[model samples]
Target: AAAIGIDLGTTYSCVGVFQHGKVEIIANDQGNRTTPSYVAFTDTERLIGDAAKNQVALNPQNTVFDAKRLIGRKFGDPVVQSDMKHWPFQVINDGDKPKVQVSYKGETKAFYPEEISSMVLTKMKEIAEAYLGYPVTNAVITVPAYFNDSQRQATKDAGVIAGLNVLRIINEPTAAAIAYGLDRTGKGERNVLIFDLGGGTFDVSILTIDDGIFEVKATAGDTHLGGEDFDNRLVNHFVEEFKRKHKKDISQNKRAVRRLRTACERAKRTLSSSTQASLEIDSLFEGIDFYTSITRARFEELCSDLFRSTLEPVEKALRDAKLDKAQIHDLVLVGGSTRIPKVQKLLQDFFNGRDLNKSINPDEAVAYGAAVQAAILMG
Candidate 1:
């Protein structure tokens, strides 16, 4: 049985497979398990994933991320408006559907969310086919539970475009629970809460796993909230710092602001593994030097509000499930942002003295779960 599981994420994507009763992650040509959900085009060829993301700072206009925001939205959606103000590519209103436009090699090309997503999905499929040395067909793809009908349809369309039969669009949190439950395989009945905080979306899900059955009781999240929002908050703070030092306001300059925004994102990721980090933006409005070092405290301060805001959905999920924090026998965390210390502490506070479990790597759990589900489906 050759089947794959895809975590088709908003900012990053990963592929996994189950073979010979063992689960394995399918790595890209670069030996990376996960690829950035970004695309770039030049006169010669189209670049996807890591190749495109690596050029985000230098070619902001050409590299596109967060296309998930446009996936089943209208032109006038407030969320779209908010995203357009900062996104480098142009978002055009295509009747009821929103389309993204990018300039590559002196030509403006129009793309739908499905089309952009198809490029990434195709790469994942290629990885699977190469690994198995056979034409892999069936797959279980994960999506945010809150996604509506149109969004779900768009995902399926992307799979079709990528030449794969999408067997299911599983909710991320539920999938995470599935991964955890199958790996542990311990018990009578246990209620677990799955917190999934990805790059462009957040999901909280509560489920009951008993005797190999995983039933989702409730789920909630904000599609607009995630690591990207935290990055923007830090960028705003960096902009303010630059303004104070230079005595000039650069807020109104969209192009320069776009460049600075990319820099802040890189700096934030760098700070994740280091104590202090500096961001530099040169030649901004007549050779101005924009540089700033952010301590861990300052970074937390910038993102604290975003982190705290996630609690609302957690409470909502608990209420929907009719379970209190005490009833949750285990709490499992998922997604990249959960790596942040403040995020972990916040979850700990919400659970009220109950230790949050880190048994699964926050980054790989969801995809691994998806792969397990694929194996079940194949059987």
Candidate 2:
């Protein structure tokens, strides 16, 4: 009966369990409640979470993140096709589905998306089991709202290989609605837009709340949209800038590519609040200096496409719900990318200046909601 709930998500991962009517998202060895949904390997040691994420600047060729449910599909599928440019790992079509090829432990290896995802699941299960002082063999997992039969089955396969007996797979948008509807109970009738834009996926769910009911109205998103793409936009800009300056192509230089991603990600974060940021890397290209400043205006222009990409889905969701902008009484932003300045501003503008609902922590809410459902099942 020792089971758990896992938000085996695209950008981040978390494990949770119920104890004495309270759900506690399991913390990892590093003391964080949520772990970066990443896995990387060096010559002798395998890494996940912060340990792996930290290598993005120097060893990204061997590190991978944002795999999430993509771990299960055919390499040529629309979803996989869309992410071709965002990830650095080698991906090749293996006849049917997709497989990832990487060098690990001084040997070359090929991994299916599920294979890499299984490592994250195993780590999460281990942490939860260690915290509970028991083995956790059965787990209730969560996935995207519009995920169809093939994707859903792939996720179950991931669980089985990771030593987890799959108990249930719930929709991510529905899970977020449950977590937020608790606050709107007895408040009144209204419409809520749950904006979930993670590292590798984006989902916006529009639902109706009335008489303590939160029923889904519509949902829309891209299987391949998220924060990783945003970082890549900046990375590409840096790449071209370097080429324009030095008249040399640095894409073949792994460390140079790594430095661009590292600096771009930091700049993305800093630009979220500040109006300006800089991408600075000493001895970045050709053993020369590297530096560039990015204003919020310029950053938004580069990311205008991404922001618009999300809006296209949001507009579809709102239209599918048959609700006007004013009808959306509460708009909740979830996912790490929601912190981006462009997204925040765009949502505000789209909602006609309505304040965003910031009641729950975005990163943990999915895992928490999944655990709530698991506890309910146990009861």
Candidate 3:
């Protein structure tokens, strides 16, 4: 039997395996390298990943996303309080812990955040088992470095519930560091910085590698900030623009917002490599079509503050590491959001024109590292 590694991200997930002395990222049946971290309950059955996300518009109340933000958090946590307002699904307080309530198989069911997370893990496990053609039962998972003990424990519990023996729960940045350091067996000691910004979370970590051992020096991040926030900026901009041009307010319409958010997300991805992107929605609201476009410069201007926010965590990590910018041998990018050109440009400027490392695939590095660790454990 083979073991696998999982990167259980807030908005997406990926699984990898070490085989034939190389790591291969396993794709789901949909042929996607990464699966959406979404689950949906229908009258007949439950759905995960792409199927779940595809039906979110019509079944918003039963489709659950962003479970990572609520996992291990108290219902009264400031972060939970802030995020609850934006979620379409219901989250009720159960003895100070958050429980997501959704309709499943014709009945309303309440699940702890850990349970929802477990379902996602099960989906990843199923994908790995199919690809490996074995009953895989062992795995390693990666979480944000800033996650506390309770959060880490909750993740481990998720793995157990998914029916796998979780070999280790490593920090996301540390996992990426392993992916980077593994191939260069004889490299000298070096200090590396990992900048991880994904769909729903951001983290920065500094590490030291020596004699094949990777040690984290410092880590810092905002659990609530990431590529989703960037999409929100663009969505809000278009919402107001639509109001001005069409003389209507779509702010109170959940369906409209969800549709527009999806469009904005696509446009944001487009803006990463293009100078301009246009969003069009048919019958967006009240039978009115909505069309708007944004230039890359405008997109950068809209999220300039968010881009600047990333630097603070980098600075804090460097400070806590007790080192200056010059001492960092490499700045490794570790999440999907790092693809934003402005983010990379700003990071390069902050590091005094030093080129950032882009050799590793940001989306797969963490899982790749986790798979490497799982292979090591098996030996």
Candidate 4:
């Protein structure tokens, strides 16, 4: 048995094992390095990852996603409360304490956030057991750097319930920096600006490394902001167009929003390079085909305010670090949303034409670095 690391993310997840002095990502049964962080339930079965995503539209009510956003929250936390408008699944709420709820099999089931999370962990455990050809038992998991004590312990509890020993829980950004800074020679000082814009959260961290010593200068971010926000801009645009053209409001339709999510995300990618993105959804509403196109200019126009809002955190991080942009040596972009053309351009402009360093795979960096830490622990 070997030590493994798990990147439990809000949007997706990845697992890796350390050996031969390196990290090898363990692909899921779907033959992919990343698995969608989703869980769908039917009366007799619970589906995880891609299988869950596939059933989202068919069993929309029972399919619970974005559960990561729900995990480890205090009862009626401002953070969890703000997320009310974003999640599609039924949220279990209580005025009493730190408990949560879920709906499955047409019944309301109350549980701790760890209980819901353990279900996902069990799925990962299954994959590792298959690959290692043994019962997997231990792991190092990565969570956001800003996760608090309650959240951290809750995550460990998830591992326990899933039948694995949680060896350690490292901050997600630090894990990324480990994979990023490990290769650099210990000759001179280096300051790397780590910009992470994932599906549901965005964090900007400033780290300085000197002769192998890594220290975090400062970090800033918004848990409620990221790729999903950008996608919603387009989804809303489609909604308005559909209302005006077809005289129908599909905004409140869960299945319609779920069906359009993939297309909306695809359009965002297409507009990253091309000037225009178009989508044609057959039977989008009441068996009526819906089609629309978005220009790069229009894309920015729709999400312009949201994009600009992110700059406040960027400037705040720099201020908190007490370092000017010129002092930063490297700019690193981690997470899928950083692939946006506007984001790329903005990053370049921020760093004074310095080419952004994308040495690590955005989706796998956290897991890769966590595996390195796990191997070190095993020794």
lDDT comparison, 2 vs 3, better candidate: 3
Instruction: Quote the positional error of residue 263 for candidate 4 in Å.
Output: 1.7
**After aligning candidate 1 to the native by TM-score, how far in Å is the CA of 376 from where it should be?**
2.4
Give me candidate 4's TM-score against the actual structure: 0.89
| Candidate 1 similarity to native, TM-score | 0.85
Candidate 2 residue lDDT tens string, 1-379: 5578888987789888867867787889989887887889888888988688878766777787767646657777786787767678877778877877788899988888888888889888888988998888888888877778877888888889899888889877656666665535675777878899887778899877786566779989876788778888888888888889888888888778877787888898799789999777999877888878988898888889888778888889888999888888778877778877678788888777889865666777777777777776667
Report the lDDT of model 3 for residue 77. Answer: 98
TM-score of 2: 0.81
Q: Write the per-residue lDDT of candidate 3 for residues 1-379, one digit (tens) a residue.
A: 8889999989999999999989999999999888999999999979999899888988999999999999989999998999999888999999999999999999989999889999999999999999988788999999887789989999999999999899999988878878876435456868889999888888898988877777789989887789989999998999999989989999999899989999999999899889999888999999999877899999999999999999999999999999999999888898889989999999999999998877767888899899998998999
Task: List the candidate 2 regions with Cα displacement exceeding 4 Å.
Answer: 1-3, 17-27, 30-33, 56-62, 75-95, 106-108, 129-135, 182-190, 208-216, 237-252, 273-280, 289-298
Q: lDDT tens digits, residues 1-379, model 1?
A: 4778888888889888978877788888889878889998776668899899876766777788887777777778887888899787788887867888888777888899889998989888888888888887888888877788988899888988998888888877777777765435556878988888888888888878786677889988887788888788887887787778887887887667767777877887776678788887787645787766888788988887888998999999999999988999888888888877788888898888788767776766778888988888878
lDDT of each: 0.82, 0.80, 0.90, 0.80
Least lDDT summed over 10 consecutive residues: which range in candidate 4? 93-102
Report the C-alpha lDDT of model 4 over 30-78, residue by residue, as the tens digit.
8977888887777777789889988888887667767677677765787
For all candidates, the clash counts are 0, 4, 0, 0
Best-performing candidate as measured by TM-score: 3
Runs off by more than 4 Å, candidate 4? 93-97, 129-134, 183-189, 273-278, 295-297
RMSD of each candidate relative to the true structure: 3.3, 3.7, 2.1, 2.7
In model 3, which range of ten residues has the least summed lDDT? 180-189
